Amino acid sequence: RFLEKYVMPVAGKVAEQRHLLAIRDGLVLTMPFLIIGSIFLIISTLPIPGYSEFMASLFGKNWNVALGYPVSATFNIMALIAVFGIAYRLGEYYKVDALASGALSLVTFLLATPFQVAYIMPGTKESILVDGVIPAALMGSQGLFVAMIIAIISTEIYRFLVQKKMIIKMPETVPPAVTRSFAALIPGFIVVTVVWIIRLIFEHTTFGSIHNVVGKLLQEPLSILGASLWGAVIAVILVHVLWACGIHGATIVGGVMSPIWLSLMDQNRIAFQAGQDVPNTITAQFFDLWIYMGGSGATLALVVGMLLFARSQQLKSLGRLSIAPGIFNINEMVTFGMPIVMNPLLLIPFIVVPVVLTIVSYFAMEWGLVARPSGAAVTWTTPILFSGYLGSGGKISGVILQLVNFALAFVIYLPFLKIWDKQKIAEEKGEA
Amino acid sequence: RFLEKYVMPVAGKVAEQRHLLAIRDGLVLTMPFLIIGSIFLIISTLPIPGYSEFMASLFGKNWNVALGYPVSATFNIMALIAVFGIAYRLGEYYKVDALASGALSLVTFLLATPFQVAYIMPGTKESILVDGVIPAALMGSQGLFVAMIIAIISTEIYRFLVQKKMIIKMPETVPPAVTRSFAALIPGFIVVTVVWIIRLIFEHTTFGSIHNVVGKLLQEPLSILGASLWGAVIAVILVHVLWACGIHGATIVGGVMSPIWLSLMDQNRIAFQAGQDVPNTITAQFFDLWIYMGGSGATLALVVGMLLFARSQQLKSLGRLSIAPGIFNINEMVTFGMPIVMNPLLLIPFIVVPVVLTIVSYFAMEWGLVARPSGAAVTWTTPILFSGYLGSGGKISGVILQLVNFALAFVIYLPFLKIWDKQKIAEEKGEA
Ligand SMILES: CC(=O)N[C@@H]1[C@@H](O)[C@H](O[C@@H]2O[C@H](CO)[C@@H](O)[C@H](O)[C@H]2NC(C)=O)[C@@H](CO)O[C@H]1O
Numbered sequence: 001r002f003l004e005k006y007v008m009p010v011a012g013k014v015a016e017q018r019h020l021l022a023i024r025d026g027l028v029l030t031m032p033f034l035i036i037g038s039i040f041l042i043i044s045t046l047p048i049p050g051y052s053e054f055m056a057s058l059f060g061k062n063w064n065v066a067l068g069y070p071v072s073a074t075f076n077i078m079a080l081i082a083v084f085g086i087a088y089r090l091g092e093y094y095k096v097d098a099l100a101s102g103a104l105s106l107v108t109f110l111l112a113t114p115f116q117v118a119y120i121m122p123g124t125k126e127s128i129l130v131d132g133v134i135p136a137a138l139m140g141s142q143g144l145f146v147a148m149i150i151a152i153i154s155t156e157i158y159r160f161l162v163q164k165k166m167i168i169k170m171p172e173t174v175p176p177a178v179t180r181s182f183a184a185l186i187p188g189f190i191v192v193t194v195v196w197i198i199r200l201i202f203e204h205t206t207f208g209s210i211h212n213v214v215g216k217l218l219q220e221p222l223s224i225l226g227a228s229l230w231g232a233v234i235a236v237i238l239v240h241v242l243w244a245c246g247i248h249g250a251t252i253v254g255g256v257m258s259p260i261w262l263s264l265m266d267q268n269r270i271a272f273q274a275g276q277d278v279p280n281t282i283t284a285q286f287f288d289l290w291i292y293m294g295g296s297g298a299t300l301a302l303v304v305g306m307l308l309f310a311r312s313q314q315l316k317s318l319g320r321l322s323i324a325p326g327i328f329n330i331n332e333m334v335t336f337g338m339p340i341v342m343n344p345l346l347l348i349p350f351i352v353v354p355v356v357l358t359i360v361s362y363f364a365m366e367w368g369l370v371a372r373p374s375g376a377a378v379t380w381t382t383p384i385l386f387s388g389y390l391g392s393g394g395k396i397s398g399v400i401l402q403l404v405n406f407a408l409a410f411v412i413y414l415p416f417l418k419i420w421d422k423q424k425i426a427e428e429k430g431e432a
Numbered sequence: 433r434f435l436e437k438y439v440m441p442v443a444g445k446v447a448e449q450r451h452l453l454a455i456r457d458g459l460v461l462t463m464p465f466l467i468i469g470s471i472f473l474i475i476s477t478l479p480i481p482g483y484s485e486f487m488a489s490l491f492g493k494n495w496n497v498a499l500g501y502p503v504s505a506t507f508n509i510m511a512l513i514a515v516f517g518i519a520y521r522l523g524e525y526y527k528v529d530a531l532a533s534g535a536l537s538l539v540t541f542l543l544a545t546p547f548q549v550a551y552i553m554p555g556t557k558e559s560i561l562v563d564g565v566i567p568a569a570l571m572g573s574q575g576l577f578v579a580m581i582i583a584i585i586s587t588e589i590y591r592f593l594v595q596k597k598m599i600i601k602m603p604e605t606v607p608p609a610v611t612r613s614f615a616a617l618i619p620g621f622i623v624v625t626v627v628w629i630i631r632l633i634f635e636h637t638t639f640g641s642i643h644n645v646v647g648k649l650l651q652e653p654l655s656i657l658g659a660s661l662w663g664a665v666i667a668v669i670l671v672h673v674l675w676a677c678g679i680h681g682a683t684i685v686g687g688v689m690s691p692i693w694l695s696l697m698d699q700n701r702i703a704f705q706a707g708q709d710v711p712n713t714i715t716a717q718f719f720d721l722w723i724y725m726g727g728s729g730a731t732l733a734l735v736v737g738m739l740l741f742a743r744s745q746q747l748k749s750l751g752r753l754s755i756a757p758g759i760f761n762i763n764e765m766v767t768f769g770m771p772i773v774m775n776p777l778l779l780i781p782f783i784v785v786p787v788v789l790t791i792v793s794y795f796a797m798e799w800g801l802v803a804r805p806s807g808a809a810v811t812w813t814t815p816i817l818f819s820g821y822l823g824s825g826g827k828i829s830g831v832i833l834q835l836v837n838f839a840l841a842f843v844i845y846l847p848f849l850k851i852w853d854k855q856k857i858a859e860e861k862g863e864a
Pocket residue numbers: 028031239248249250251254288292295296297329330331332380606607609610613
């Protein structure tokens with residue numbers, strides 16, 4: 001409760017920031033997709049004993065290429081969708097035409113990235129080049145850093161222009177569709193012109209693209225801080241001392257760091273679906289499946305410790321009613337019911353348990369004892385045991401990491417919850 | 433005024449057809465963009481004396497390449513924009529999640545169009561195959577004819593599932609953003625599973641792909657009817673007998689034809705900026721710039737007449753208050769304001785003059801006497817003389833077709849404009 005005149009005003013200014021908000025929320029537009037694409041991803045890469053052939057007989061030899069189609073349409077397009085989302089949202093926000101702001105930036109994005117791919121002859125400084133081609137790697141996870149930048153730049157200029165009433169003023173008699181279209185025309189024009197001119201500029205620098213300067217000075221070195229151990233710790237430690245103030249750190253931090261956590265995730269995904277070594281430990285589903293187990297503490301453990309050791313009626317019930325939302329990694333019932341939010345005693349293991357589960361989980365995967373995330377974006381709401389297996393692209397070395405973490409949490413919480421249960425049975429006999 | 437218990441019910445009912453409406457209004461999203469793209473096009477193609485070289489001196493002998501950037505981000509991205517538009521609208525309609533339905537149909541377009549491009553060295557069956565690319569020829573005009581079939585089919589199925597409550601029931605304490613997503617997760621997944629299959633089928637045919645079967649069976653034949661003289665005369669008649677009932681005929685015919693009218697305008701553009709003879713006569717701007725001159729039916733001519741030969745006190749002040757909007761090709765004040773709309777005097781020239789002007793241009797352009805439309809989509813609101821100039825890519829045989837055309841209307845209207853004015857002074861004196 002006490003150190004809330006230090007964390008909770010800053011936490012409020014961040015969660016209200018319109019730009020991290022616009023990005024954070026707009027990014028949600030991708031989620032159901034990155035999932036749909038993972039059902040196909042992990043139906044074709046599932047390492048079942050008589051599976052690689054099982055499917056071969058029925059379909060054919062290349063039973064595996066079809067199952068790569070949806071993955072193309074979702075995973076290699078993340079930033080395209082994400083660009084609509086973000087602009088559209090920052091659109092709704094500024095009370096401008098959202099449909100417009102969110103298509104303007106679809107267009108703008110494309111304008112920013114070149115419609116051509118160049119093949120080079122190895123160390124010969126000569127080349128051929130395919131044109132009228134949207135490089136489908138500049139759409140994927142490696143571009144949502146420019147998806148942000150340009151969606152935010154476009155929509156921001158776009159709203160400022162309608163708000164400056166710089167607009168085509170169509171006669172009232174003309175249909176309403178007509179009025180809306182021509183309204184946009186002038187801002188729209190000016191926006192593409194700016195982005196265009198921005199391009200031409202980097203078109204004339206060392207880095208030839210927009211995506212390039214942005215990836216060299218931003219996307220790249222930040223992906224580094226991201227897969228850091230300090231990167232995974234400081235994120236997890238922020239994610240929870242936000243919940244502490246009753247905010248949803250998971251989506252708040254998640255919303256800042258996901259442009260990196262799914263870039264890394266994606267890399268792993270590409271390697272995996274080609275029999276290669278999986279490079280990163282820190283992905284999105286790293287935390288989602290090996291740290292955020294019950295929900296936002298290792299809560300699932302705490303909930304089994306109420307359903308097991310809770311003498312009082314107050315908890316024996318809270319744990320009776322919150323294995324379900326817990327089993328699926330949803331925990332509002334606990335953080336807010338126990339409560340854990342703003343609760344001195346319980347807040348201790350609530351912050352500690354995830355760092356201790358991050359450090360552990362982290363190393364297990366480096367030491368190579370425990371598999372890495374395959375990169376299949378399995379959703380944050382996946383039952384603890386099926387989650388670990390499927391997150392390692394079908395590697396049981398991941399199930400044992402969870403059973404391990406589960407056990408670790410179940411013991412760090414236990415003594416803390418005993419101390420609560422006892423405080424609770426006290427006032428439950430109206431003790432004062 | 434009597435045969436309007438024959439078409440008045442036919443018209444009205446098509447205007448409320450939910451798919452032709454989704455399409456009609458979805459395409460309006462691509463509009464302002466081609467207007468924007470075209471401003472760049474018609475800059476870097478201006479055949480003005482002492483220009484092509486003047487610019488080359490200031491930026492480089494390679495300047496035309498940059499002004500082809502905005503063009504690629506608009507024109508070559510029609511269908512990609514128009515899938516969102518149609519799917520959204522058609523979703524807005526069914527009162528479902530539009531952002532969803534729209535972002536879903538965009539993902540479904542890209543799923544149905546393959547990320548390979550195949551090149552071939554004639555004769556030798558020698559080839560090179562590029563993976564990881566979106567064929568920009570397919571996001572352009574050549575696609576919007578499947579953009580429809582994919583938005584419609586994808587949205588139709590989508591709302592169906594959502595209405596049957598085939599969704600994921602998330603806990604009520606869980607954030608509303610979390611609730612909206614999984615809500616979509618099942619329908620969305622089923623949706624792609626469908627279209628995906630609809631692909632794997634044609635990837636087993638003489639067609640090989642979706643973009644192909646659709647091109648051959650639908651987009652190619654309907655394209656030739658559209659470029660036909662009848663196709664530019666049944667369509668222009670349809671547009672005016674439809675105003676003869678008070679409905680926006682252009683908007684109706686348009687949003688039902690334009691998937692063809694603006695394929696022809698793209699393939700006039702493909703040629704134009706590669707210095708070739710522009711193939712088709714009939715494009716979107718064939719009508720807007722040479723036929724629909726004042727608005728509904730060379731209305732500008734009939735209006736001019738009122739400013740010149742204004743016997744009555746009313747037609748004199750109607751004219752005084754409708755060349756302003758007439759100049760810009762809006763003519764509501766006239767169609768509805770002196771009631772051409774259901775009146776059977778003014779309706780005679782209202783319907784004829786267009787269908788005249790159409791032939792007196794479809795031949796003027798086949799007889800090579802007048803320049804075909806460059807294919808720069810210049811907006812229908814562009815004033816008369818400049819229109820014929822820019823609409824031809826700077827050729828003057830366009831500024832003349834107008835003059836002859838606007839002259840020609842003036843003398844099919846003048847007799848009626850007189851007859852009417854006659855009536856209006858009588859009933860304004862107190863006579864008969
Ligand atoms: C759609 C969406 O934004 N999903 C994710 C969040 O819901 C999720 O946070 C988790 O949400 C649950 C309900 O709101 C919470 O009970 C749960 O505690 C919470 N997880 C944490 C660590 O706080 C996270 C998952 O990483 O991010 C969003 O993407």
